[model samples]
Target: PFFPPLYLGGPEITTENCEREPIHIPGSIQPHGALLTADGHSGEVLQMSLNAATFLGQEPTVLRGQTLAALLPEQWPALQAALPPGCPDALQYRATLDWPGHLSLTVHRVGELLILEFEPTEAWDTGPHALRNAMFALESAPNLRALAEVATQTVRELTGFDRVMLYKFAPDATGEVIAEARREGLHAFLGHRFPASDIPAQARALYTRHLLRLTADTRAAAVPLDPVLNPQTNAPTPLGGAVLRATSPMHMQFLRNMGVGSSLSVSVVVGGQLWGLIACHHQTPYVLPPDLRTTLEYLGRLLSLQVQVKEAADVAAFRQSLREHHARVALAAAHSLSPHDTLSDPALDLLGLMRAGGLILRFEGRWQTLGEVPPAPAVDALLAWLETQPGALVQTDALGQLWPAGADLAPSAAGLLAISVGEGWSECLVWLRPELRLEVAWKDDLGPRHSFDTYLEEKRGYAEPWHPGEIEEAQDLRDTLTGAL
Candidate 1:
């Protein structure tokens, strides 16, 4: 089939619907620009948008059989070199041309097809270009929050968006607006959080090729890919990760509901993984010039680098602190005759070994705990469940999700880190973390939620998941105590 039916509205338009929307080949693109589909091996123009010749001001160049170079004689040389022969589809280049009236040419490949998008160069020509100063500002930030603050401020200056946000994703894929810069009178999204379902899973998979995504207008012009399917694949050309791939209809509707005319998202990739995003929203339709878009892509790479470095530094520091606490607890262990006696030591600070709200231990046939924890029945149930589990240590953000018996442990034991020390996993030490009450900015169910108003749901059933460093430290503690015996 050439094209599929679109579900614009109604109860049927759900998160699941948005998740599986085959946006890779919507067979269309935004109308502000034009796209060309050519043979990857020969450069023979295979397909084109209807507005191509009219928008390019080079009419009468079309024919049933034509070459990309024949139609774009003036710009073909630069573009051909930009996409070298036999190169993997991973490489994409953006450049400018003059005989075509200062147009920006971006070329990339999908499967066996060469694709190009041409736009009237504007953002790159007139937007802010102080990358050196921006780099300086980024490095001066002392912490993650400070770093995000710097990014939000500088990105807003670079792209004149009505609002800009630094959205940090959690291990659960949920995101929080850690920092934001908005023009006066706009709603502030700073500290706001959003559910992971909002972005869906498949849509996130399409973000690899494009570090920066600019939706010029949601609810606006859409140009269909004339022939629809690629001759090589006999299907919609694989559009994964390419810029100008059609946006999902549900996503477009969500943006429209939020009153956003246009928006942009700059991905923050850390060590080849998506870490966060620098999101921008505008009140009216806008296009990020090709040059400026390329510059922002550069910025995303740098930002990813800085974040990778900063987070590793933080992990090292926290690991060091955990070692200090371990040393103190071990000192107490050395001085005590039995495991139970070690727990009573005034010099011991077991909870300090990790960021836990409480420390629960079962040693020498007795149970002892410090600080906040669940009731005796729930604790007893958790210890019993851990006995059947086979691991030196166990960790979970929501204890109830994995073990239904711990369902009532919320507000106190939502998160658990357990370490077995005794023979047959009989005696164990567990850490507790209270539930993380998050006010999530959710949509999809309510129509008004699309307005981006100050609406939130106080959600529970989670806590900060234990970091790998802490888990490693917990294992070290268990082994150290095992050898101490």
Candidate 2:
């Protein structure tokens, strides 16, 4: 079956109802949404509408003649991976994404320009439903076991999936199959474990696009492979992550091993950390019905809130373990502080240990990074302000100007903490929260500068070459010998 292509970059057009005559987007060069128009032979990101610029956070003017490769990051090997041989010349890709600072970056690409559109996830707008009710109860539950149980049971009732499970994440993106539930006729995946490497950082980061809801249909034809994919390089590929259709045999096999013909997953963001996932597996191919999708979506949104609340509670209860361990490590490495300082020394070396972008140390008037020291007095002032903050855990939504990532914002993990090390000073720990939730709505009149309205607009307008996503960097301040002298 040949699908007719539509052009959506220009004016709106209307057509009488084939459901009527394959409705035309009145005023377009070609009817339909004006989405994709790949020459296949040229391998260009072709032309797209003003909305296309929204994905890269650049003005639409930037996309008019740019190459597709120009809009993405250099580190993302996926862009390179998608360019190879025996692949289709033209196709469509759909996924949830966060480019620059925005979340839920729903996108479309044709020739050289990929159009990015932002949409609220199921966790955004919500409704009154049974899954919502269950999540509310679960958030108040006493332990992880109970939380896992609620997730499993609720997913079963909500998605009609054969088996439901709550998986826990490690510091890296790998996971442990901790808790699971299944109907009598289903298989139990409770003790089963999947390596953290399965959902690598790039893959996990891409999930921000599919935030909280995804349907895996085995029978659905993946976007046709590009003919002579990556015509530049025909070497066998590594899984370069892309926001396009997923056709990786490795992933397909993984899904199959779980006895899943189709599946849906809801993200769990807790205490500024991406704790894990609420995964629902089906034994057959399926696309959720609209009403049913609405129900599950509402539930997914509630689950995000429930995760936040539960994470706070969980952190308060379990962080003692980390504290105790930190203390032990610190004491053992106390002697190393004289030369390089304990924060960067083997004892407090959380840089590699936590897999953080960088670790920061805070002091009275100076600071140090994992390998280097920070500005003396300037670091001191920031550290002083940090000590005065009210809570052990703080997020960008709460800190306003105090957030070091600064006035210009981007998508950052929440539940970010200013953990106290000693004295009146504190240390900041950062992590990428799975399903990181940002409170983007704020009223305009709150103030001339401090209002969320200003912040929200800034966030929304930020584009591809966005404020470097430094939400996970760490640093420390210490008085330097030159300044002290």
Candidate 3:
């Protein structure tokens, strides 16, 4: 059953609590919805919230006491097949289902309760909410605008979505909502916050597997990777490749809960790393055609430049501070640390740059030659590689590839720091040092039946998947290092 708050200008009606027609909602005493237990013991599943039992015109029974296949019709063999593995306490699969009528469901563990939700055959259409609002936001900013602001607004304008924003990941891997464009009468999330868990390292890694565009229309086929000829290899390989599977189920679940049915995003890249996104969204399902999406791609590129420029300026200032901080930290290490103190020095120096979980450094060695020559095993590999080059500074990726695995240069270090040595090792400051980002996880909190007041619910509602990492940087002695000449 589909139910939602009273939306003006559309067919929706307001609600006193979280309930609407068609869908069976929790009784008045509970309001938001009835809670079910994951385990068969402890708490019993609420009878009214089970649409399968009520809509089928049968008396409801305890859900936790039986597997989903027991309640579903015999024809739903596919649903039974799709049941996720494990008990509620298992780490991976959290829900189960039986499908006769294309009935999809989710088992959400919230506190001691498991909230079972049904997926509608006809996902509600927010009727171009994301698209309409996005257009208004773009037009509203007629004059000068921040690059992030403009980009975010463009997304809203293009998709009538709610809470469109540009998220820039910090050196520490946490992200900030730099700019936001929202629809009128919608809950404004311009300055709303998010933590590192919102996009963990694992999720961020998906950038390599996917391209600029991500959409929720599972029926839409994936765009194949563009073919590119590599100059280094003189061979053609997939360019900007992407995984051609269905859209992320987790993302879909997030949209449903947030009352949003559609979402589109394009990755922004600078020097080959995922910098940010031009994310678009809608509260209902939508299908964006490829020809029109080309415009989005072009716009995303322009937006990427603007965002890059803004970030570069901000980061330049941040680097300036890092230099001063590193110097102080280096001086502190030189006075009271050992060679192993390099680890502590690097860690503290990085913390000064951005909060991080860890840090790694690789330096080239010049052997016995001191002043202006490489001095570490890593340094030796880099210098030897550079001898094959005609430039003063070789791109780290080029040199890194040549370094043997685990010996001097071979563990995967997509994001790393390198420094060169000069005149007594003082000349080399740091090499290709980017901030170390920590990995964290965050789950979406809103759903399809949510209203304009979803923001308030966030403050009061607490459940599973809202956890944060617990590790912290311990004490360490620091030291100094130089950059390439």
Identify the candidate with maximal TM-score.
Answer: 1
Q: Best-fitting candidate, measured by lDDT? A: 1
lDDT (10s digit) by residue, model 1, range 1-485: 12243522323446545555566666777888888788876778777777777767765346325886776687677777777777777688776766447777778866577888778874335234487788877887776777888888888888888989888888767778888899998766776777777776656655654576778998786777767666666766665555666677777777787788898898898766778999888888988877777667777887998888777777788888889888878777776677876775645767766678887888866798888988887777777788888768788888878888788877788888988886566777888898875442326553335323322342457777788888888998898788666
Q: lDDT, candidate 1, residue 207? A: 63
TM-score of 2: 0.39
Q: Which structure is stronger by lDDT: 1 or 2?
A: 1
> What root-mean-square deviation over C-alphas does model 1 reach?
4.3
Off by over 4 Å in 3: 1-145, 217-244, 315-485
Candidate 1: where is the Cα deviation over 4 Å? 1-15, 40-44, 60-66, 122-129, 229-242, 335-349, 377-392, 424-428, 440-460, 481-485
Candidate 1 lDDT (Cα, 0 to 1): 0.74
lDDT of 3 by residue, 134-182 (tens): 4344444433235567677666666566657666655545455567787
The local lDDT score (0 to 100) that residue 236 gets in candidate 3 is 24
Error of 3 at 344 (Å): 33
Lowest lDDT sum, 10 consecutive residues, model 2, at 24-33
State in Å the error of residue 465, model 2: 40
Give one digit per residue, the lDDT tens place, for model 2 in 1-485.
Answer: 11122222322212111121111111121110112222233325443433334434566555544554454444123543554434332332323434554334333333332333233233243234675587577777777677777777876776677778777875535455667777786545565444443454544543443444443565444332222122234321111122223333334455665546776676666545566787777888655543455466555566667666666677665545445544544454444434335445654555443333334554444456553222445345545656667644333322333465432222322123334444344434332221122342211221212222333344342212101112222112111121221
> Which parts of model 2 are misplaced by more than 4 Å?
1-128, 212-215, 225-244, 271-273, 294-298, 315-485
